[PDB]
Structures are given as structure tokens and as C-alpha cells.
Symmetry: D2
Subunit: 457 residues, 4 copies
């Protein structure tokens, strides 16, 4: 077992632990969710401390002795080694200092090991002065967040690009199938199933464009802002360097933000991304609700489509297939939305030079992106691609629908057709037979006028 000390006092650290006291304080201070910070944040945090070491060696302020040990340790965390040592709670006080410190304390103790030394020999490698040199919480943490968010969004757009492709196929596959369009859930006018799926396809096209764009503002990073944006204690040479390194390390077209005070106090890049995602899920939640409708049944329901069975839907009803893949999408949407409200609240709570609510914000932000990526992947494969149509059921609905009379409207007028249609719904007779009862159009005119393939117009 180790022992370490701080203003507050002395603390017993497990000897296996690469994490230090400031992390131990925060695990005691903020036992809130007991989740762990997103994996992709840890990776990003390591990329930053590395670029920071690299830059501090380039400006001959950090000894290459220490910096290379740090760089070595970073590279391992980047590779995915020491994640289990990041143990602070995503929901935490101190504006994300206890996250920054968790990285500082782990990268140090593992740079020690790599110098052959032992953990807690902070003398050789110092969390504050060496790992975190030229840096504050207030530039490292967000710069990480920016890179994390970007990586996840890029995963998202891949998954969505695939999802769009999936819907697009079903557009083509179902293009020739005729069905009843519904409006207020009331039977309206003929439409082809495939036109509905094109509709889905295009809203998704748009979601992709909006989420793509949300990234633009993230490419700007506040590195070398230090405390407030003033960039005190940072050498412009370090600032120029640490960015180029971050650009190389990350593989992202990052750029120093033109105003550092601005990029340090404003959280609008995040609210913007969340906003784009919320929109996305509103759309998808709807499309989900549609599929669940059309798949209602299989007898006392619309029964226009069928979705791949993925599990026994019920515990007591034999032969129960529930639309569970859509359902999960619905539920995800409810998350993302609720998360947006958290994000927004947090974004607003900012005061003067710093927003201290960044943690819960980022927790929800990153969560939102991940959840969607997962939901979409499973939904693309397990449900969407496997959707099948009941054309005979769908054609039947057309053949027994008053609503076809919307085609006889420009010859007979809305008033003469409204009365024929009110009579047909009540008596339950075909529209054709009530047009021959009133003798309002001829039979050879009805064969033409009341022909279902009027969707194309």
C-alpha cells in the first residue's frame, strides 16, 4: 500500500494503483453514479498530454528525460492499456479538474514505471508541474472532449450512412406495392409503400448533413488558453506546436480558435451538436412509430409489413413477435432528448470566464452519440434490412377504400363526392356502385378515374 499527501491531508493509495490522491479525493467527493468516463475521452486525454509533452520538449522547457516517459505512457493509454485506472465519476464537481488530474496522476506513475522507478516517486515525474505543464484543466479537458466528440460523430455518420443505404434499398424494393395512405389515422388516398420508405430515406439524408455540420465548430480548440483564455503561462511557440502535434496525433484538421477567451467560456459547440442529434432522433422515433403501426397485428391490426423476429416477444402468449428493434429506437430517442435538456441547462449555467457544469454536459453528449450509433447499427441489421411486405393485405385495403373517390373529385366536384362518400362509409358499399347509383360517372369512366396507380402525379 502507498501513502501520499496534499493540503487536505494524507491518503492511503493501493500500491497497484497508478492513480494519485487528487483522484482519491474526487472518488470520495463525488460518489454519484459510479460510472466511468467514456473510453474515447480517456484516449483523447492521453493524446493531449502527449502533444503537450512533445511541445514542452520542443520548447526546451520539459526535460526529454521525463517527457519521453510521459509520451511512452500516453501511447499505451492511447493503445487502450490503463483505462481501468480512470476512476473519477462523470458527474463531478470542480468543472472537470478531477478528470484532468486522474490523467495527470496515471500518466505520471506509469511514466515512472517506464523509467524503471516506482509509483509515488512524483519527485522524478510531477503530475502538476510536468504532465500538466503549459496547461490548465480549462484547455486540456475541453480539447480532449472536442477530439472525443469528433471521433464518435464520425463513427455515427458511418453507421447512419449505412442506415440510409438500408432504407434506400427498401424504397426501391417496395416501390411497386400499393397501399392506403392514412391521415389523422383516417383512410385517405393511395400511396406506394416505397414512397413512404423514400420519405424515411431523405429525412435521414438531412440528419446526416446536419450532424456532419455540427462538427465544424469542434475543429477549433482552445489549447494554450490556460486559466481563462488570456493564455498566461503559455509560450506562443508551445501554442503553435501543441496544436500541430494534436493535429498529427489525432488525425483531425484541428485549428487554434481565433479567440481563446471565447472558446474557453462558450459551450455552444456542444449545445449545437446535441441539438442536431435531438432533431435526428425525433425523426427516427417517428419512423419507428410508423413501422410498429404497419407491423401491428398480426390479425387485429394493420398488418401491412413484418419485421424480423429477434426474440420471444411475450412470456405467456405463444407465437408473439414484438417489434423490439423499433421499440429500442423509440426509447433511445427519449434518452437523447432528455439528455439535450440536461446539456442545455448545463450550457446555460455558465458564469463569466468558465462553465463549471461541463462534466454532466459531456457525459450526456458522449452518451447520446454512442447510444445512437449502437441503436442504429443493430436497427439497420436486425430489423430494417429484414423488413418484408404483405402486399396482398395492402392491395386489399386499396380495393375497399372510399378514399379512392379523391380521384373522381375534379369531374364530379367536392360536394357531389362528399355525399357519395358519406353514404358509402355508412352503408359500407363500394364507391363504384354508389357512382352508378347516382349515375354520376360512366363505368368506362370509373375504370379509368378510380384506378389506384394515381400515386404517380
Amino acid at each position: 500500500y502507498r501513502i501520499e499527501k496534499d493540503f487536505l491531508g494524507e491518503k492511503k493509495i493501493p500500491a497497484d494503483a497508478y492513480y494519485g490522491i487528487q483522484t482519491l479525493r474526487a472518488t470520495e467527493n463525488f460518489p454519484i453514479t459510479g460510472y466511468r468516463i467514456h473510453e474515447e475521452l480517456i484516449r483523447a486525454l492521453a493524446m493531449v498530454k502527449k502533444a503537450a509533452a512533445l511541445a514542452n520538449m520542443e520548447t526546451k522547457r520539459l526535460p526529454a528525460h521525463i517527457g519521453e516517459a510521459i509520451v511512452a505512457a500516453c501511447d499505451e493509454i492511447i493503445a487502450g492499456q490503463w483505462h481501468d485506472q480512470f476512476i473519477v465519476d462523470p458527474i463531478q464537481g470542480g468543472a472537470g479538474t478531477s478528470i484532468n488530474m486522474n490523467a495527470n496522476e496515471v500518466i505520471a506513475n506509469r511514466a515512472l514505471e517506464i523509467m524503471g522507478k516506482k509509483k509515488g516517486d512524483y519527485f522524478h515525474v510531477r503530475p502538476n508541474s510536468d504532465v500538466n505543464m503549459s496547461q490548465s484543466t480549462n484547455d486540456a479537458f475541453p480539447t480532449a472532449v472536442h477530439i472525443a466528440v469528433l471521433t464518435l460523430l464520425d463513427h455515427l455518420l458511418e453507421t447512419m450512412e449505412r442506415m440510409r443505404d438500408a432504407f434506400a434499398e427498401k424504397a426501391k424494393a417496395f416501390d411497386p406495392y400499393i397501399k392506403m395512405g392514412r391521415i389523422h389515422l383516417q383512410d385517405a388516398v393511395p400511396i406506394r409503400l416505397g414512397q413512404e420508405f423514400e420519405a424515411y430515406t431523405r429525412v435521414i439524408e438531412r440528419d446526416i448533413q446536419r450532424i456532419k455540420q455540427s462538427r465544424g465548430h469542434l475543429y477549433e480548440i482552445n489549447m494554450g488558453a490556460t486559466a481563462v483564455g488570456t493564455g498566461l503561462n503559455a509560450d506562443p511557440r508551445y501554442i503553435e506546436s501543441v496544436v500541430k502535434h494534436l493535429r498529427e496525433i489525432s488525425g483531425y484538421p484541428l485549428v487554434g480558435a481565433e479567440n481563446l477567451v471565447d472558446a474557453t467560456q462558450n459551450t455552444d459547440a456542444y449545445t449545437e451538436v446535441s441539438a442536431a442529434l435531438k432533431v435526428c432522433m425525433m425523426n427516427m422515433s417517428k419512423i419507428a412509430n410508423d413501422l410498429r403501426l404497419m407491423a401491428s397485428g398480426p390479425r387485429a391490426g394493420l398488418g401491412e409489413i413484418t419485421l424480423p423476429a429477434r426474440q420471444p416477444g411475450s412470456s405467456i402468449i405463444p407465437g408473439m413477435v414484438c417489434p423490439v428493434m423499433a421499440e429500442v429506437i423509440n426509447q433511445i430517442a427519449f434518452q437523447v432528448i432528455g439528455n439535450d435538456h440536461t446539456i442545455c441547462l448545463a450550457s446555460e449555467a455558465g458564469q463569466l470566464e468558465l462553465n463549471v457544469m461541463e462534466p454532466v454536459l459531456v457525459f450526456n453528449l458522449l452518451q447520446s452519440i454512442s447510444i445512437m450509433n449502437n441503436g442504429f447499427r443493430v436497427f439497420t441489421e436486425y430489423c430494417v434490412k429484414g423488413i418484408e411486405a404483405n402486399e396482398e393485405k395492402m392491395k386489399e385495403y386499396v380495393e375497399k377504400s372510399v378514399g379512392v373517390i379523391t380521384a373522381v373529385n375534379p369531374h364530379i366536384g367536392y360536394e357531389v363526392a362528399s355525399r357519395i362518400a358519406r353514404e358509402a362509409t355508412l352503408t359500407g358499399q363500394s364507391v363504384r356502385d354508389l357512382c352508378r347509383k347516382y349515375d354520376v360517372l360512366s363505368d368506362e369512366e370509373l375504370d379509368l378515374i378510380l384506378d389506384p396507380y394515381e400515386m404517380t402525379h
Copy 2:
């Protein structure tokens, strides 16, 4: 065009206008929605200034010649006269001072008229010193709000009490009608339409109880808190009196809040009411969505019920009758909810001794209660009461339904019924006719097992 002044400068007031400069400033300062403050708040504001005058006369500090003129003017605003004059915007800066002052400047100029003077002759009847004596914005405005909110809530509960009665009838009416219960929209086991409507009836019973309770905290009023809650420069005798009067005037069992600092800085009474309403509308929005489904018609949908036509549903489709009464309920719910978020935000934004966001809060609060009361009234009368069943459509679904096999399960055993169920799904034949094809059960027996009542009670249908 009369001229008035305050420590900022001078303004031209129309001479017709009973409202003063501080109101003019606010109409310039906050031209935001250009709505007018709720009618029921104006009434309440007048009730308060009246109780305040009455109390200030009773403690021999306001001259009876001025107070009675004020009381007279209040009584008219209560009766519904001078509402046109209230012209400040519900969304406004200043924590609701510009509302308080719009009541002060109108009650004064009309108490003037009533004592034979002319408007603007403030020397005699003073907005600040007389109308608003023993009072701050921070006690008059909320105390009004509390009375307003209570009156509207009481209208609401009457409307809902009536709505629950409406649903309850449809529970009884539809009690014998059998249909397919749905689960994930998939066909499950039989249920009677009336059981669904009892479900609606009871959630509403509960909504009523929650909204009823939300009122408790409103009965406490902070009158005589003055600026901050310390109650400084206000006489306990005035505080005791002004409450007593407000109780008589309003009709409500109001009580001075035990802690005035508390009742002046905390807005939790309001967030509490909103909360109760949000819950209410979640439930109703659901019930609405149900009805819209069950009325999916005319042919390509469930078609289990029909809701009264109230208008031509569509402009181009002949014969379209839409569930527009339910639809409006859905839309209201979305408001109430969004409003709760506004309310909550505003309630949280409080700092130290005062919450300055009370206006938008109250705007949304009062709006929510009103729009609900209205939505419910119209929905009760023009939809719920007029709902009818398609019992032959509903019974048909049962008769051609696989899930019915759960009811004849204990008399055939799981093995023999697993095969009858797999056969009925494939062939698509009724399970009754597959029970006498196999001749596992008698016709009389099947009458008793596939009884509307028997398939839908706890027990084994035997």
C-alpha cells in the same frame, strides 16, 4: 395628452388612459408578446389592493376618504370593468413590478374619478403611497397570483370532475363489449372495451387528487412580507387584517405563511402545481392517442370506435371525419409540458431573496391551467360523451384471434392446444370451430369459456 413624471423623466400619457407613466415605460420596455396579463390575475390584483386598502383604514393609517375610493375602484375591476387599461406584457423585466404598478396607476386614476377629481391628480390618490401602502411588488403580486391560480384550478377540477363522470359512463356502457387487447400493438388476450374506459376513468380520478393537493401550499400567502420577507415597516395588525379580508374577498381559506422570508423567495408552490398538471396531460395525451387508434377508420384501420364528427376533417378527401377533439388534447399536452420546462427553468433561476422570473413563470402557469380547463370542457362534451362502439367489428377480432387459445388452455391442456393454435394461425380458422372439429369441447361449454365476461376476469374461464 396629460403629462406625468418620475425620477427618470417625463412622458405624454393619453388623457383617456387610467394607466400612468410606470406602465407606459414598461409597455415601451417590454413590447414582447403583446399579450395581456390573464384576466383572472387582474381580478386578483384588485382583490388584493382592496383588502390592503381595507386593512390600512382599519389600522387608522389610510384616510377613509381615499381608501373607500380605492375600494370602489377595485370592486369595479373585480366586477370586470377596467381590464382594457391593463396593458403591460406578461413577459416583462422587473420581477412583476410593472404589473403591480399597472394595478396601482389604474386603481388610483379611477379612485380619483370616483372622488370627483381628474386622472393624473395624484396629489390626492397616490399610486405608490396610498394604493400600494404596506405593500411591495414582492407580496402583492404573488398573493394575487396565488388567488388567481386557486380560482382557475377550482374551475379545472370541476371540469375534470365532469370529465371523469363522462368516462365513467362509457365504462358502464361498454362493459359488455369484448375486443382484442393489444400489447406492443400485437394481438394478445380478450379484454372488454369498458375495462379500458375504467382504466381511463381511474387515472383521471388520480389526476384530480394530485391537482387538488397542489393547492395546499397556495393557501399560504406572504402578504406583509414587503421587500424581502423581514416584513419591515408593516404592522402585524395590518398583516392579520389584510389576510382576514383576503379570505372573505376571495372566498379561499388563505392563511399568513409562518415564515415570510421563505414564502417570498421560494417558488416551489408553482413548480408543484405545474408538475401535477404535466402528469395529468401525459395521461390524457395517451388516452387521446388510444382513441385516435381505435377510431382509425373508416376501413383501413382498427375501427373499434367512432368519435362525433365536429367538422369536415379534410379539404380534398371527400368523407374525411378526423378525431379532431382528441388531436387538440394531444396538442395541449405538448404545450403544458413545454410550459412546465419554462416554469421550472424560471423557478430555478431565483437568486437569494427574490425570484425575478416570476412573470414568464406565472404566464405559463396560468396559461397551462386555462388551456387545460378549456380543452377538457370541449373534449368532454363534443367527443367523450358521444363516443360509440363497433361491437360487431370488435367481436369479430376475438372470433378470428389466436390469443383466445389462452382461455381454452386449462381444459385442453398445453399439449393439445399448442397444436390447435399452430393450426389456427396457419389455416386462419376460428379456435371455436377447431375445438369442435377436434371435438375436444362441447358447444355449450365453448359458450361459457368464450364468454365476454369469463375471458376477462381473474380465474380460468370455467
Copy 3:
């Protein structure tokens, strides 16, 4: 008094009223808020019915007799005449049919008058068959909404462009004033007031760009979609015409949307705009909260700035100036946000070929835009432009702040300065005198190192 009839029955219309029965039904059916539909929607509705008349004459299906009377009536409503006759409730059932009908019934009865005839002579001019020809609720109403929303957004961006200009001046004006940056509300490091106002200026720059972009999707309009998107009962010639007219009439670069089924069932254009606005107000609500802080006082408070007095702030405290212009901005933000939640809910509730919740949606959407435009206009003039600084109070804060020791950190190290800073806060002595007590830097090194104008970095 007039009398009119429909399936439901006979109705007594005031004789003065240009509105018909279908409007009377809806005023009875939906006595919800008793507001009136936005003025700018009425204007838009008229622009549409006009383009529709014009197009129906061009395709020689509407008699020029009737159409020109309609066009005449439209032109007056456009000019702002008959607004008082639009009396249906913004929150209403029927997906916005009762709005469409209110226009139909007013434009007809006023086209009658302009033919010398009398109201209720629907025989001459028919609400359904003539005013509303080639049209459904489901294309007229949204196409209007699209034009309304665009006009209001354009007003908004003007107002905001002006607001940005206002902040930008204060950036320059306050550039030389030094103050204490605060972080978690704790005193941190020097910053210039003007850097704070640049921060405000740039977040606003960004808001403008996002709101500008939100418009793109609105330019696409679904005109000639009719019921469902299929475009049944609409002649492609009418479709081509009615757009070009709408483009000319409106003055907007409108375009027929590539898919009509898509633009008829998806409400993502609206959720997108709301989203952009919500973000905007999060930012502004913050900036507002900042100003109210810095203007706290005037004695027991920060007292770094002063805002124009705009009214007696209090009823009993003499000499009370409250930051009421900022406060109203805060309150507006709370609206816009809550409205976004309404909009989103409504947008999601869509089912199959139509979203029937469009009304409350549009009510909140249009409201949001208007409220902001108003709030911003008043806030730009009445508060922002008049903001004044208390430099002597702000300089004083610098001169008595431990936080200046962040500048002596790279020479002394974080550990030696953390102890000097913990001692100075407790004892309340200057940092200089505790650096000469420890003799850790010379006096000529402190004159340089602890010099406040380190913000520039």
C-alpha cells in the same frame, strides 16, 4: 345576420363577418387560448391562395371572372386589411384545416364583395372548389408557414446583426479596462472587460450563422402535394406555375421540393429552426446572467458595470435600478426552450403520411422567433448600447487579488506559490509582501512578473 349550412347543420353568421361556417365550427370546437394566428401567417396564407388562383387561371381551369376577384381580395389581406376576420385558435384540431378554411371563407366572401355581389353567395365564389382549387390543407398551410417563418427569421437576423454590432462596439470601448477574471465565481486571473465582450460578440456571430442556415430547408415547398404527397388532382403545369408565382409574390428563392411525399410528412425543417434558436437563447441567457452579476450592487456586489436605468426597479426601496432589460432576455430564453420541447413533441407525434400537430408547433415556432426579435431589439437599444464601466472598481479588484500569483508560477513552481497563496488568502496580505517574506522573487522581478497586463498572451 346571415345563415349558412354544412353536414353538421345550419349556423348563424354575423352579417359583417367575411368568415364562414367551417370557421365558426372551429371557434366553437377549439376555444383554447383565444389567441389569433400570427399576422405574418395570414399574409403568407393570402400569398399562397393568390399564386394558386393565378396558376389555376394560367391552366384555364379557374374562370378569370372569379380568380381576379380572389387575387384582388388576397392582395388586400396581403396589404393588411382583413386580419380581424381570421378568428380560429392557433391551438386547434384538424391539422390546420380550420386555418386553411378561415382563409378560404374570407377570401371568397371578399372576392364576392369585389364582384359587387354579397357575402354567402358561395354560388359565385366557392371556398372549397375555387379558392382552394388544386390544393389541400396539407400543402397550402405548410407552404404558408414556410414563407412566414422565413420572413420572421429575416427580421430576426437583421435585429441580431444589429445586436452583434452593439456588442462589438463595447468590445472595443472596454478593451483597455482591466478586471479580475472569475472561475467557479472564485477570483482567478486578470482579464480585460473588452475580452469578455468580444466573447459575447463571437458567440452571437455563430448564432447568426446557425439561424441563417436553418432557413435553407424552408425554401423547399410542397405545393401541389395535395392530400398525401402523391400530387393527385394537381396538374404538373399548375405545380410548375404556382411555385414560380409564389417565388415572385413572396420574393423568396422558393423551389419545389424534390420529393413531395417527403416534404408533406416530415417536420424536420421546423425542429431544425427551433433547435438553432434554443442554442441562441442558451448563449444569450448566459450573457444576460453575466451582465446582471457584473451590475450587481451598487455597494454590496461586484459593481463592475452599470446598465441604463429604464424604470423604478422597486416599489419600496428608493433609488432602485434593476437590470430589467437583461431579465426580460432571461425570461424569453425560458420561453423559447420550453417552446422547443413543445415543437419537438409535436414533430415526433407525426403518423404515416401527415403530422396533425403542426398547429401548436407553428404557434410556438413563430412565437419563439417574434419574441426573440422583440427582446433583442429592445435589449440592443435600451440596455446594451448604454452599458458603462466602473474601471476604478475593476482596477481595485486586480490590485487586491491573490490570483495575480498565477504569473509567478513558472519561476517559483506551483507548490511554492500554492503555499504563499493559501497564506495570503487567510492572513489577507498582498502577494508581493508574502513573496518578500519568503524572499522567493526580488522586488524588481515582482514589478515585472506580477504586472497585471498579462492578459495579452
Copy 4:
């Protein structure tokens, strides 16, 4: 790697695993958050399956040899053994069937072990037929949730009861300390720090009462509703028993809900609790924001109080101690609220006889209650109890404060004090020293008028 099958096909289960195929499917189907379902739900799930076994033995329909093995396995999960095995994702399709089945497949395979068999030997102990007898997803899962929610709420109220005690002490401690009340952040009239803390104390008192009440509706449980609420194929004797057992097992005064259709389709019990919590956190988030203000320090801010340092506040600024305990409260509030929106959305999305969104609902609900209980515990101990006052800083603000003129107003009159107040603002001198400069009041008199207690009670400070 054992092999299992159901009507979809075959799967390879690790042999270590007590979980079955239906759980494996769901872990594949719903790899969403990769969180695990709350611990307290697992406990509850086990309590239910136990009461269910017990009841099915008591009604002579489950063999005692299987039931006791089940009961044994439940008791272990209750005791906290087999939680590792619960592996389905809180956010999942299927309305919480995959949770029910994860309990069924684990309790079975471990009841097997306990009757000497091997896992996968379902013949003997069957997930569906035995573990889940007399039960559907739609009664077991919610009944669990109800018990879970109750247990966490009871932890919450203990924590809050303690929190209110904490604030209440600071009310007493700080009762004599005078400071400037603020209004719109502008200086107003004197108030005592302790009055502010009593305000906090009482809002919390009220939060407790609201959360207490939210529980009432949870005590009603839908056990024996089976699929839809009709309760078909479940024996009233089982229903009477299984409740009785759940009451003993859980400790809670549970009761069979009068209407089972109602308690099966309505989710208003949950929206009600969330609502109460949201209100709570609005209040706390405010109180938090207050404390952060008053602790704005060290020099360039209010500096009226100090909160216990709990960590180095900053990484680059030496000496930075931040109000991190309050900050965490703020952040929690934002969660709870956002979660309420998720909950509400989900509650509304219900259709007809079942709400299939119950999982995300419950995930957020349970999360909200937990994170609150934790936030409060740590905030009570590491912040509230350790708060200290800067009474000389606070008294100084009073002594150099214009608003103090409201207190010496009745003894000088409005005319003479209007001029002393305009002079004190300009010159910046204390109003006490301007009262003896003009010699309008004696020093002894000023002691009594500018008394901490006198400036802050109802009355006239004389």
C-alpha cells in the same frame, strides 16, 4: 460451451453462465449503453419470483421440490450473490421481457445447482413454466420496479431528513448574523443569514413531504394481472397469497391494486415520483447557486460565507478552492430534470393495454433517485455541516448600505430621510453617522433601530 434453443433457433452459452438464451439474444439485440440494471431492481426481481414460487407451492400447483430450490436461489440473489449474471441492457426493446427472462434463466440454473443438477437441465427447473408461473413480464417486472423504487425513496428520505437537520442547525447558528438582503442582485434591506437558511430548511421540509406522498400509489401492485390486466389463468388464491408474501419479504405495506387493467397500462405512479423529484432539485439547484454566490471569493466577490475545501480547486491557479460540493448538486439537478423529460416522454408513449417503454423510464427513474441520495449524502457531510460565516464582512455591508434607510424612516419621516439617503449614496458615508451628523437620532437609539433583530422582524424597528 453449453448449447440451448428456442423457437428462433440455437445458441452457444458459456457453461459458466447461469443466464440462458433469451438473455443472450437480448445482449446481442440491445448492446446500447452496456450498463447493468440497477442492483436494487435485481434484488426486487428476486423478491418477486420468491413470493411467486412461495404462492405457487401454497396453492399446490408448483412442486415443493422445485419451488424451494427457486426460493433458495432467490434468497441468494436477494443476499447479493448472482448479480454478475444479470447482463441485459437497461435500455432494451421488448417492454422489459428480456429483464424478466434474465431473472428467470438465472434463478432456474442456480435452483438447478442447488438441487444437485447441472445448468441447462431445464427439464427439471423451467424458466418459463416454473420460475415464471402465474406471471407475465407485465406484472413481475413492474411489481419489482415498485418495490425497488420504494426502497430507494426510503433511503432518499432518510438522507434528506438528515440534510434538513443540517440546514436547520445553520439556521440557528447564523440566526444573529446580519447581512444585506439582495433583490435582482441589487442591495435592498437587512436580513439575517439564518433567515436565509431557515428558508432553505423549509423548502426541504416540503420536498420531503412531496416525495413521501409520491410513494402512496406505488404500494398498489398489479401482481396476477398476467398479460393485460384481465388476470386470466391466475388463481385469486395465488393473487391473495403472492401479495401477502411480497409484503413480508419486502417489508412494505403493499396491496393488490383494485383494478388490474388500470395498474397494468397506466404509468402515472412513476411520472408522479419523477415530478416530485424534479421540483426537489429545482429548489436545491437554486440553494446551490445561492451558496456559490455567497462564497464568491476570496476577494473579488460577495465573500459572505466559506464552504469546506474538499480538493485543490484548480490546476494552474494557486490557492483556488472551488464550491465543488454545490457544483455537483447543480449538475445532478440538470440530470434529474433531463431524466424527467425522458420519463415523461416514455410514459406518454404507452399504447392501449401496455407501455413498452417502461425500461428507459425505470432506468432514468432509479438513476434519478440514486444520484440524488448520493449527492445529498456527500453534500450534507462535506459541505452543509462545514459552512462558516464571514460576519464582519456581512455586517460591514449593512453599515455601508443605503437600504438601511428604510429602517430609520418612521422616526425621521420620509422628507428628512429622503435627503439623508441621497447624501449617503453620493458621499458614501454610513447612515448611522449621517443620523448623528444631522443629530436627528441618539446613539443609544441607533443601537436599537440598527439592531440585527429589529431591522429584520415585522414592525417598525422601535
